[PDB]
Amino acid sequence: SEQLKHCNGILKELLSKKHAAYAFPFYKPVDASALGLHDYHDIIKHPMDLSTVKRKMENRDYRDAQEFAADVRLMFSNCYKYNPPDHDVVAMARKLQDVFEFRYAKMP
Amino acid sequence: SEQLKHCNGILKELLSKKHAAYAFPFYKPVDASALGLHDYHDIIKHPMDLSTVKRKMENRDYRDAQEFAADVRLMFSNCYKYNPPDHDVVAMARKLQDVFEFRYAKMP
Ligand code: NI
């Protein structure tokens, strides 16, 4: 419970206005068709995004902090796998992952 | 098996000379007494380091890639939790974590 509240706080921070300049690509599931990324679902077999993490937290799906962290990290991994490493979206993922990792490390 | 070989390859890369300039603090368990860090084990309840990850891989302890990644990430989290964020060791952890995350994302 306490560890999951820490996770929920992190989630709320990742969704907050403070980080929006680099968090916004991760707010919703990638709409591959809409973006013309017709290879997305051949490369990324387990899509993840912050709205899905939020649904899982609200539904009490996550049983521990490790499960939560694995999904947030999956989201970043998908970005690093799909996009060339010099693309702006990758720089955004790295910055948001920094925010996540530093606060996650302050695990009660 | 294939995913665990990918993990073992990553591990070997993290231990290789190519990354030694920033990987070396993570090679062995933190010797808190030797370094004068008498609060280390009060702050870090689950120490982790690359020699421990290697032992667990050689002993077939890891049953899947997620388990392996959780230990490598724990190692970095410990660094981010214990050290002020402007210390050189934190910069080293961030650089090694970049190496890890980008290659881990190329999960077969
Ligand atoms: Ni993890």
mmCIF file with all atom_site columns, C-alpha atoms in Angstrom, chain A residues 37-78:
data_model
loop_
_atom_site.group_PDB
_atom_site.id
_atom_site.type_symbol
_atom_site.label_atom_id
_atom_site.label_alt_id
_atom_site.label_comp_id
_atom_site.label_asym_id
_atom_site.label_entity_id
_atom_site.label_seq_id
_atom_site.pdbx_PDB_ins_code
_atom_site.Cartn_x
_atom_site.Cartn_y
_atom_site.Cartn_z
_atom_site.occupancy
_atom_site.B_iso_or_equiv
_atom_site.pdbx_formal_charge
_atom_site.auth_seq_id
_atom_site.auth_comp_id
_atom_site.auth_asym_id
_atom_site.auth_atom_id
_atom_site.pdbx_PDB_model_num
ATOM 1  C CA . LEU A 1 37 ? 3.572  4.104  -38.525 1.00 0.00 ? 37 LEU A CA 1
ATOM 2  C CA . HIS A 1 38 ? 2.387  0.986  -40.293 1.00 0.00 ? 38 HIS A CA 1
ATOM 3  C CA . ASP A 1 39 ? 5.260  -1.099 -38.918 1.00 0.00 ? 39 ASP A CA 1
ATOM 4  C CA . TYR A 1 40 ? 4.701  -0.087 -35.246 1.00 0.00 ? 40 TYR A CA 1
ATOM 5  C CA . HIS A 1 41 ? 2.801  -3.185 -34.155 1.00 0.00 ? 41 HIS A CA 1
ATOM 6  C CA . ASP A 1 42 ? 5.218  -5.504 -35.968 1.00 0.00 ? 42 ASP A CA 1
ATOM 7  C CA . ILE A 1 43 ? 8.118  -4.056 -33.971 1.00 0.00 ? 43 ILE A CA 1
ATOM 8  C CA . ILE A 1 44 ? 6.383  -3.327 -30.641 1.00 0.00 ? 44 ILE A CA 1
ATOM 9  C CA . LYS A 1 45 ? 4.549  -6.400 -29.392 1.00 0.00 ? 45 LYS A CA 1
ATOM 10 C CA . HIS A 1 46 ? 3.551  -4.977 -25.987 1.00 0.00 ? 46 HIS A CA 1
ATOM 11 C CA . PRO A 1 47 ? 2.434  -1.346 -26.307 1.00 0.00 ? 47 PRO A CA 1
ATOM 12 C CA . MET A 1 48 ? 2.274  0.732  -23.129 1.00 0.00 ? 48 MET A CA 1
ATOM 13 C CA . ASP A 1 49 ? 1.451  4.331  -22.263 1.00 0.00 ? 49 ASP A CA 1
ATOM 14 C CA . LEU A 1 50 ? 0.603  6.429  -19.216 1.00 0.00 ? 50 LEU A CA 1
ATOM 15 C CA . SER A 1 51 ? -3.191 6.308  -19.668 1.00 0.00 ? 51 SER A CA 1
ATOM 16 C CA . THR A 1 52 ? -2.956 2.489  -19.563 1.00 0.00 ? 52 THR A CA 1
ATOM 17 C CA . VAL A 1 53 ? -0.746 2.662  -16.435 1.00 0.00 ? 53 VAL A CA 1
ATOM 18 C CA . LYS A 1 54 ? -3.331 5.011  -14.871 1.00 0.00 ? 54 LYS A CA 1
ATOM 19 C CA . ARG A 1 55 ? -6.218 2.649  -15.708 1.00 0.00 ? 55 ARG A CA 1
ATOM 20 C CA . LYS A 1 56 ? -4.329 -0.265 -14.196 1.00 0.00 ? 56 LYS A CA 1
ATOM 21 C CA . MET A 1 57 ? -3.616 1.724  -11.028 1.00 0.00 ? 57 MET A CA 1
ATOM 22 C CA . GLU A 1 58 ? -7.250 2.922  -10.703 1.00 0.00 ? 58 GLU A CA 1
ATOM 23 C CA . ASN A 1 59 ? -8.485 -0.687 -11.236 1.00 0.00 ? 59 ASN A CA 1
ATOM 24 C CA . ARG A 1 60 ? -6.045 -1.982 -8.545  1.00 0.00 ? 60 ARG A CA 1
ATOM 25 C CA . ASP A 1 61 ? -4.367 -4.176 -11.157 1.00 0.00 ? 61 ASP A CA 1
ATOM 26 C CA . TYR A 1 62 ? -0.852 -3.523 -9.844  1.00 0.00 ? 62 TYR A CA 1
ATOM 27 C CA . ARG A 1 63 ? -0.063 -5.677 -6.857  1.00 0.00 ? 63 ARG A CA 1
ATOM 28 C CA . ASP A 1 64 ? 3.358  -4.181 -6.087  1.00 0.00 ? 64 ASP A CA 1
ATOM 29 C CA . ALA A 1 65 ? 5.757  -1.415 -7.072  1.00 0.00 ? 65 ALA A CA 1
ATOM 30 C CA . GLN A 1 66 ? 7.848  -3.746 -9.255  1.00 0.00 ? 66 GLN A CA 1
ATOM 31 C CA . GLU A 1 67 ? 4.889  -4.517 -11.470 1.00 0.00 ? 67 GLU A CA 1
ATOM 32 C CA . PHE A 1 68 ? 4.149  -0.808 -11.895 1.00 0.00 ? 68 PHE A CA 1
ATOM 33 C CA . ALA A 1 69 ? 7.780  0.027  -12.673 1.00 0.00 ? 69 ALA A CA 1
ATOM 34 C CA . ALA A 1 70 ? 8.015  -2.742 -15.254 1.00 0.00 ? 70 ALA A CA 1
ATOM 35 C CA . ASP A 1 71 ? 5.115  -1.174 -17.205 1.00 0.00 ? 71 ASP A CA 1
ATOM 36 C CA . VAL A 1 72 ? 6.484  2.379  -17.034 1.00 0.00 ? 72 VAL A CA 1
ATOM 37 C CA . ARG A 1 73 ? 9.902  1.076  -18.154 1.00 0.00 ? 73 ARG A CA 1
ATOM 38 C CA . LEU A 1 74 ? 8.251  -0.977 -20.948 1.00 0.00 ? 74 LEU A CA 1
ATOM 39 C CA . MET A 1 75 ? 6.791  2.267  -22.257 1.00 0.00 ? 75 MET A CA 1
ATOM 40 C CA . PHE A 1 76 ? 10.254 3.827  -22.470 1.00 0.00 ? 76 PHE A CA 1
ATOM 41 C CA . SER A 1 77 ? 11.790 0.630  -23.957 1.00 0.00 ? 77 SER A CA 1
ATOM 42 C CA . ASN A 1 78 ? 9.199  0.678  -26.739 1.00 0.00 ? 78 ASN A CA 1
#
